[PDB]
Design a protein around this ligand. Structure first.
Ligand code: HEM
Ligand SMILES: [Mn+2]
Length: 466
């Protein structure tokens, strides 16, 4: 087996992990190497911590390592048996991946929904403008969360509510927060198989409630669209993912049931929520903490957008510094620092070590992004490192893996980058910014809180200036 820290009876290595396990794993891998054994109680895990080993696991042996380790929480509403995020690579997963790549996240689809998203960007601008008038700080975590939910709702469901903090959006927010609280803490049933039939912390039961609420909402939207289409056969077609779902269901060419589609919408909605919210906040934190970089981005946006307040998504090729800024945020702050777990589908030798069937595989993208043998001055926020650099986060550069790579690489990437780029551009282009309170600025920026997505422990509060 790969080398690793001595595991104690019962607990294995769990007592050493602390509040930020990705940081502890990063330190440990400097000692034990880029394939490292970790015993999470009885859940045997191998941590992968170099571009070389990431390529061996995700690419060379990409089929063997194409499964997922499935948390007990994911059994909520039988999601484990239905979800593209957790099913093994087989016909159902392949069909859903095809629908995502060719239909939902196609260039045509993303382009068709730019208008839907533009409304939500305008609402963010309005919210910040009100704060600017009163000289009050913007809670960037809250504003990013609401904006992300709005942009996701707009794209998935054509939600066109005129209030920034609409009823539907705030209901989604409560559900997403609920999921995060449930899963952000260790479920002992994941680590001790004898506890699985007991659900001793009520994690699965509580997840049932929140997944159930999300599924009921999505089912309601689907039913409403089905009826509205039946009743209005001459109305123009909507430009959202729900329209695609209806058309696929009615064409009946896939061996998939209605529940595959509703659980798929659930995965897309949840998938894009905490990840984008935390990333927008980190982007703003980095830019405010590094004023020369804020100035360079503002200058780019001024030259391209001029007096226009809301940048067109189609202008992205004209904005290389904005692209570089977001690559650099992804390098330093991958929202899932250990990605999503993979699993060995069979015994496989890698670099002379046996990885047994069933092993949980965690790619420490955070460690790779901060490794000084890979990235010069890795703790420095330096978007210029990406200018005229072909390195990207699409999965082909094993130094930069915030969306993963190989078989299960993030399918929402085309929508995620539009959300990250446009929310960041909207905030930066339209206002100057200062910290509400800078007395502990450096500590506030450095301190992370582990969870579904890693976040700044102290929410970023910044005052917009005209
Ligand atoms: C900045 C935002 C995002 C980051 C950093 C991110 C990151 C990831 C990562 C690391 C994985 C696992 C990849 C692997 O196993 O190799 C993933 C899977 C997934 N993501 Fe994303 N994601 C983001 C936004 C989104 C968005 C916007 C959607 C939907 C619109 C989405 C939907 C999914 C789904 C459904 C999977 C499961 C794919 C599978 O297992 O086949 N994510 N995400
Ligand atoms: Mn189950």
């Amino acid at each position: 087996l790969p080398p690793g820290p001595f595991p104690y009876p019962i607990v294995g290595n769990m007592l050493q992990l602390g509040a930020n396990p990705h940081q502890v794993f990063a330190k440990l891998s400097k000692r034990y190497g880029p394939l490292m054994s970790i015993h999470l109680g009885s859940l045997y895990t191998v941590i992968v911590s170099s571009p070389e080993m990431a390529k061996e696991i995700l690419h060379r042996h990409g089929q063997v390592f194409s499964g997922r380790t499935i948390a007990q929480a994911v059994h909520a509403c039988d999601h484990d048996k239905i979800s593209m995020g957790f099913l093994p690579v087989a016909s159902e997963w392949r069909d859903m991946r095809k629908i995502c790549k060719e239909q939902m996240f196609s260039n045509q689809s993303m382009e068709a929904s730019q208008g839907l998203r533009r409304q939500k960007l305008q609402q963010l601008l309005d919210h910040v403008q009100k704060c600017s008038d009163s000289g009050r700080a913007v809670d960037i975590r809250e504003a990013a969360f609401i904006t992300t939910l709005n942009l996701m709702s707009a794209t998935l469901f054509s939600s066109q509510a005129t209030e920034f903090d609409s009823k539907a959006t705030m209901e989604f927010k409560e559900i997403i927060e609920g999921v995060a609280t449930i899963v952000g803490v260790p479920n002992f049933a994941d680590y001790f198989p004898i506890l699985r039939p007991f659900d001793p912390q009520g994690v699965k039961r509580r997840a049932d409630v929140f997944f159930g609420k999300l599924l009921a909402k999505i089912e309601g939207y689907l039913n409403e669209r089905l009826e509205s289409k039946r009743a209005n056969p001459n109305a123009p077609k909507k430009d959202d993912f729900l329209e695609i779902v209806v058309d696929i269901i009615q064409a009946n060419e896939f061996k998939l049931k209605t529940h595959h589609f509703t659980h798929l919408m659930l995965d897309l909605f949840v998938g894009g929520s905490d990840t984008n919210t935390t990333s927008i906040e980190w982007a703003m934190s980095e830019l405010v903490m590094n004023p020369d970089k804020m100035a360079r981005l503002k200058a780019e946006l001024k030259s391209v957008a001029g007096d226009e307040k809301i940048v067109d998504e189609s202008a992205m090729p004209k904005l290389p510094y904005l692209q570089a800024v977001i690559k650099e945020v992804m390098r330093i702050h991958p929202p899932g620092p250990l990605l999503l777990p993979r699993k060995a589908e069979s015994d496989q030798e890698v670099n002379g070590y046996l990885i047994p069937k069933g092993t949980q595989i965690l790619i420490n993208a955070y460690a790779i992004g901060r490794d000084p043998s890979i990235w010069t001055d890795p703790e420095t926020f330096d978007p210029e490192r990406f200018l005229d650099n072909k390195i990207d986060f699409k999965g082909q550069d094993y130094e930069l893996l915030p969306f993963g790579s190989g078989r299960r690489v993030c399918p929402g990437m085309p929508l995620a980058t539009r959300i990250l780029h446009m929310a960041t551009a909207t905030l930066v282009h339209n206002f100057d910014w200062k910290l509400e309170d800078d007395s502990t600025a450096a500590a506030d920026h450095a301190g992370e809180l582990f969870g579904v997505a890693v976040r700044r422990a102290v929410p970023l509060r910044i005052i917009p200036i005209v």
